Design a protein around this ligand. Structure first.
Ligand SMILES: Cc1oc(-c2ccccc2)nc1CCC(=O)c1ccc(/C=C2\SC(=O)NC2=O)cc1
Length: 260
């Protein structure tokens, strides 16, 4: 029954709005500078960065940025975990599997949702109060200048799908309930949940984007781009650990990160 699938879509969208304070709808309102209810402050060089603290609520500059990214990721992990517990069936899973599903799903979600905050010229920061240009980030000293480029490239393509928050809420639930994560103890109940989530996403895209042929398939193919961003980023962090011997990765992020 599609009524049951529409009910699940509504439930997940409701829970997404409650869990993620900065939605895509709000990010696009900020970025499309027609909606000038509150415009962001734009950080494009070293002096604009230095004035950003004077307006936004805010040791090398590449480092200070890198820690802002980590801190935002820690906050995102907390939001995703709260979202995860609303996915019907998730909290009834073996706790070791719950932990495993979050450990591998969190970064794929973070870059999915980071795309909502991006256009081809930069990224919103600090709850949309700021905008950091892609050029400025690319100008950071090695290896920090290479950190953000594959995210922008992913986002440009991902954003061409024109998903909205109600689509993304189900897609993110599909990502979390992936039965193919390493170390899972009971794959079958995870797969049963993901099958129902996939039926829901499929109907959602049909109803919400009836003119977008094979959007469902094109979205599922994006899960390949996501896994590739994660791998690249893990290697980039290993270079950081060896050159930045005075730099600390947040312990929550440290725990999530386990290579291979
Ligand atoms: C580019 C930028 O700068 C700032 C900022 C904020 C406050 C002060 C100064 C700068 N906010 C952003 C936007 C979000 C950012 O683009 C991002 C967030 C998380 C991950 C995921 C990572 S990064 C890691 O080391 N571990 C992770 O899990 C990647 C990128």
């Amino acid at each position: 029954e599609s009524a049951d699938l529409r009910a699940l879509a509504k439930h997940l969208y409701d829970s997404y709005i409650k869990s993620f304070p900065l939605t895509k709808a709000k990010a696009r309102a900020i970025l499309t500078g027609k909606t000038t209810d509150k415009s962001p402050f734009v950080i494009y060089d070293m002096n604009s960065l230095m004035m950003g603290e004077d307006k936004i609520k805010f040791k090398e500059v590449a480092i200070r940025i890198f820690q802002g990214c980590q801190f935002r990721s820690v906050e995102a992990v907390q939001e995703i975990t709260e979202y995860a517990k609303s996915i019907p069936g998730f909290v009834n899973l073996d706790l070791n599997d719950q932990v495993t599903l979050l450990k591998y799903g969190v970064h794929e979600i973070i870059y999915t949702m980071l795309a909502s905050l991006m256009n081809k010229d930069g990224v919103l920061i600090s709850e949309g109060q700021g905008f950091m240009t892609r050029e400025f980030l690319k100008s950071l000293r090695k290896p920090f200048g290479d950190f953000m480029e594959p995210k922008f490239e992913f986002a440009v393509k991902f954003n061409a799908l024109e998903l909205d928050d109600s689509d993304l809420a189900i897609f993110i639930a599909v990502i979390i309930l992936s039965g193919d994560r390493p170390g899972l103890l009971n794959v079958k109940p995870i797969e049963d949940i993901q099958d129902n989530l996939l039926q829901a996403l499929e109907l959602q895209l049909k109803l919400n984007h009836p003119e977008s042929s094979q959007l469902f398939a094109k979205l599922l193919q994006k899960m390949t781009d996501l896994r590739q961003i994660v791998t690249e980023h893990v290697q980039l962090l290993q270079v950081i650990k060896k050159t930045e011997t005075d730099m600390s990765l947040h312990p929550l992020l440290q725990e999530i990160y386990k290579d291979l």
